[PDB]
């Protein structure tokens, strides 16, 4: 297993991040536990979840399944970097009750307390905003997070679905009073969708955040979706031809589209690694092979032809 | 129900603030509980109280009635923005024992502890000074409030009955060391009394505080006090004629004086909204209609004729 | 002559401030010079001017008259705490060309250069904002003013016609980065108009600004206006004349001059450095000097306060 | 003429910005001067230039033309908010000698001295970075710029062609030590190219920068380019011509000029101070003045938005 | 009873400070309790003690006697401003074990914990250094005190037996990071010993500290020590004549030397008031009369003749 | 010649400080110049003056004598650490005109310009406050002094006749915004007057100021005053003469000069940079040079301390 520092900080993480979103809705408690044990034995120490994972009136379940996993002992809690999230509505879907979503100090206080209980642990390692909230100022947010830090209930703060300027404003606000700022950003980044390269990844790299790519197969579409007979891209013939060129290229070189989508992300400057969400032990073994896979300059070249990136702003749209 | 951000912060509040001052002296526990339930169902999430509410040797009772309301469950505590106050003497009326009123770190420590117990909650959402105390410096006050913030016992700090310069000094002191300053000011503001417009509301707006108007009917006087046969204004014929012109104008347009007093405040720049203190469910329904009521430019114009405002300083008295 | 510190700072000033706005429109150069020499002789060291003084097409004239006064030598410049002002349109009366009034760093730069030229001096001691500009941020303003301090062109910064909250915001912003903030506020304050008490004077006292009262006789109304019917609009209102009448009558009984009393009153108010004495002749100065030696009895102060009630500090003024 | 504050600061500017890049390559000195006088007459006070303007072996010429304009007197320098730029190679076209482009403190020093000489003025009002330099730190850049502020050589600092995150990093660094940060960003923004909306315009609004739109007609494409086939590459692409065709057709129906509409549109966007009007003759100015008096209906704005969809703010633009 | 702000802070204190040093060694528990009750009824709210009070192997006893007083209820703890001290050796007299005296963060942590237990309260209102410790830096000291402040265990910090420069250095260090600095200094100050006037009281006044005078009768010597037939001053005939002139002056005007020693201190600029240590209820009544006593300019004048002060530095020794 | 750092700073100075107050009142220009050349020759690099030196109608004369000394060239200005002072009234003896003494930014500006003119130099190395001014705030004072540092007119700032708490307040205020604080305190300190030990010398040592002792022979009393009866008021008091007698007698026994011993004693005190040697002739300098080569035995130090007991540090001096 390949390890790297999470951005500028002292924390060492596996380049694969184990996503837990299938634990509950798709994978049952017992199967989830076995996959997490297999993850540890493959050397994956970095586990990502969220309070909303489980969905519907079952939001929280994924966190509970990790909770019951830790309760078995054998150093499970101790050896994992536990990441969860705050922002999402945890009541019934539809318009949230005021301050029961987003990033007010009020919502942060209630969300973390429920998360800690469901996870059956006294501390979260990495507590991440699930989305930017432009209506809450950073002196309010950092107040909330620092309370938790001084109580020993979180160690690190991270982001998800931010613009680059939000990363800068966040970390500058934090540094002003000596606080450790965001240590990571979780952004949608894959061959089909590369606009994170304009400003999100440049900012993250400037401010020493780890970059974690979610939806690394663009919702399946990069996992061989044509060979097996997301959906909206297959109807548009422009994008369909793009994936067809993709699959044809990978047949020729004898590589799995699932695996290269992940290995490609592992080559991008600033990327810590992708989130992999296996529903089974065999989907996990396949992610581990993708982490080992070396892609040639020739393949790297042709992927860029099919899947061109926009470049950094302002060059992407000006000069 | 109309919602707005409380000044610059991430907290979302109903434009009506439910005042609780009648709960105890006028309205019994059981009736108070029903009014708070009706408030929630109308979408009011912002509840205001104070340690002194109850009065006499019954100070604290209002807080206790909210305490017993929360103890019923059904997500009552969770969905309310709970505001209370510190400053007032909680012993027998007359000269307070030293440091048993005002804003010393000593009085803040003892007042919050008693408030938390009476409210049967481990945290207050918005803890407000009831009045400025010019004898306590802001490094002392912010020490006290920050202790509470870091213990998780309060989230936000607000003010009541401050001058504009006190808001500036407060928030500047707070920002110097990274602390979130005042988020709201509760001031006496209504058609009859508009001197808050000179400096209090300008300062509040400059520093991103929500503005909350108390005594919105000027102690009844704007609620149709002539038609029904505060008192001191009715004897002075100058002010009497003012209200007479008011009531006559509102007959003509077919509007309730109770309702327009509130809707007028909802039009003023910087005003979050009025505090409404119903003693019954029907007084609450009437406040909700006032929140919906649109006042015409024509009516707005004539109210300003009858009830002229002083404008901002220094223009109000110089140029 | 009574001296005091200007607020919290090390500068000592006469409790009488020499205002110069009549120099040019009313009093010519040579007569203006005589008054300024008489002010020195009486020990008044604090001279207040403005770029706009002169009026109409002659804005700048007052500054020029001080400049020609200094050009005579004789320790004049050296003895005087020279104050002037920025904010006002120095062009044709009417709407200013953009950035040719108000408190942008652009207008500050151009306004101070023209003031230094007319005053024929290399430095202003107290450079004051004539009015608040709510569209200009304090980091902008303190940038402009700190450039001037570092070049030696000004020493101290003051205000005029601010709200209390503007004073706090100014001085907090300055202090965050080591800078000396506002040292003085020049506010409208006299027996008739007392609303500076609500928040302006409280804020100034808290931040240690001197408080300088302009229009100390309320435009002549407190200077024996009724007796000298042998301000215009005030005497037409019945209720306001009533108020002045009682004033004039009370001073008759006690054998006191209305002109001196209005200034002596201000000298009793907490945090008040002193009034602006704006002379047109040698008489205003001597009158003010007599005002400053006057001791008003508690009975007279009491009666004055019944006639001329004040609002008190806010929030109590309008609430509790 | 419509005025606004430049972002959060005290400086008032016309919503039309006079761009000068045609002065020299297209329009000669005397004709350039006529346009600048016509701009004053229309109340435009905000003039934008650059050191590189002039082109090729004549880089510097535009600055010189403004300098000769100011040398005529008549309140010209005093009325104008003068903006110019640094970053660009002022030598032979081709790879610059090291530190003779970009934003090192070394190039800033030399570039500003040459600009002040060509402009025949002792100060620039708004000194702007022409492009982001990712190899120069903000403590270096703010050192260089603060030297200039303290000497009186510039008042305000602006950017051009920055990312949103560069704006935040700049202004946070400034504010940490009291300094006034960027006051304006000059970004490429028009109906055809709307990606400034993703992060640049959001960041500018948050930090209170003015937003100045350059290439407001997308290099002439939005100025009636099809009808005037009696930008080059755009008309060759079928899909893009389709887009312009619908534009021209829609404006036919409503009786509106393409040239005026492209600017009026920008005047509706949140946080946009105004477009760069770059005249070659007196016509561009008058056209822009008409653009600024235009009220576009919600129906026209709606239709424009169907033809010319924007990305919206990031992260929603590419995710949720 | 006369009340005043304690220096610049919001805390209001009686001008008499009740010293407790006799409670234990001289006055028994029960008599001490009655004196503290009489103090409350006279309006004295400000009570001073120390961990070492009790002396010998009985150090701590005085704190315990206050502890048992509070345990009776009737709002005793609530209405008192409780002051104690840290610095002194609490083991056997002689050379202290290292870090068992002075002001290391180690000694502060152990001293406060023992003090809180003996006092049977969860917080001290005013925690005072008993002496300057020039070997401990202010970043260490303020660390220690801020820990306690954020835990809610102390409110305010004060000093005792400091030089003026130590007050300045202390408060400047505190303000640098937003912390409330020293609020009071307890110094030896009385008619016989006025060198506190050189720099200690000037500094205290500049930095808004209350000034509290200990040994206000110079160890008895100003309490009519000649009439009744400290001791070392009576043998020196120079000082003896000084007190003789004192007693003769006070016979003439018909005043008690005990009472004027205290009233004189209440006239000095910057002085909050004296510490009074009654051993009986009647010594307390006498202190209360001294607080009421007005001294004439004539008497003030002659006291200054007999007991000249050195003036401020540098004028006291240069110009 | 013995050298040391001035307190915590990088400046090296002779342990003997050349005081110049006799230059003018006692010693004329030409003789003054000879002493200053002899000081250089002995390796004394630290020269102390004041604006007020000269006395009465001749205040400024000492500064002028140094100026004419420097005008001779020969590396004189370059070799010397030049110190002078501000605070004192430079006008007619009597109550100063307001702001013409003390430490307002106004008096600092005027006082330094006049000092630079009389000294015929463009910079002062160590500019010292002659006395504490309790009515002037440290943000005011550090403003004035930082203007001068940035223009190159002074390098270092020192004090004279401060309390310990004034030193701490000064240096804490400076350090809050990066500024170098006081580097030296000049206090009255000799065998007879030892109260600087209570708090002034402790504070200076804590903040790393040099300590310069003025009046090191207590106005001549420690210079063999009794033997040279062949300070005036001291010899009249029986108890004080007793003290000096024992001093003179003890030095007889040990074969030591009173004049040299009083200075050598100061050279032993912790934190003392050195005494002010103020010469009227070449003799004071040579005497001081001999003082600095003297080693006083522990027996002599012990006896000196019995005769001349000190207070020790406060709080122990008056309490415990």
Numbering used by the authors:
A (entry chain A), B (entry chain A), E (entry chain A): 1 to 229, 242 to 331
C (entry chain C), D (entry chain C), F (entry chain C): 1 to 230, 242 to 331
Manuscript text:
To obtain the apo structure of AKRtyl, we remove the carried cofactors by denaturation and refolding. We successfully obtained two apo structures of AKRtyl without any cofactor. The second apo structure has only two active conformational (R) subunits in an asymmetric unit, by combining with other asymmetric units, we can obtain an octamer containing two active tetramers (R4R4). We didn’t get the apo structures in the T4T4 state and speculate that structures in this state may not crystallize due to energetic issues. We therefore propose that the basic unit of MWC-type allosteric ensemble is a tetramer rather than an octamer for: (1) The tetramer exhibits ligand-independent T and R conformations, suggesting that the equilibrium between the T and R conformations occurs within the tetramer.
Aldo-keto reductases (AKRs) are a superfamily of oxidoreductases capable of reducing carbonyl to primary and secondary alcohols, found in all phyla. In this work, we identify the enzyme AKRtyl, which is responsible for tylosin reduction. Phylogenetic analysis indicates that AKRtyl is the founding member of subfamily D within family 12 in the AKR superfamily. Specifically, by combining steady-state and transient kinetics, X-ray crystallography and molecular dynamics simulation, we demonstrate that AKRtyl exhibits a positive synergy mediated by an unusual Monod-Wyman-Changeux (MWC) paradigm of allosteric regulation at low concentrations of the cofactor NADPH, but an inhibitory effect at high concentrations is observed.
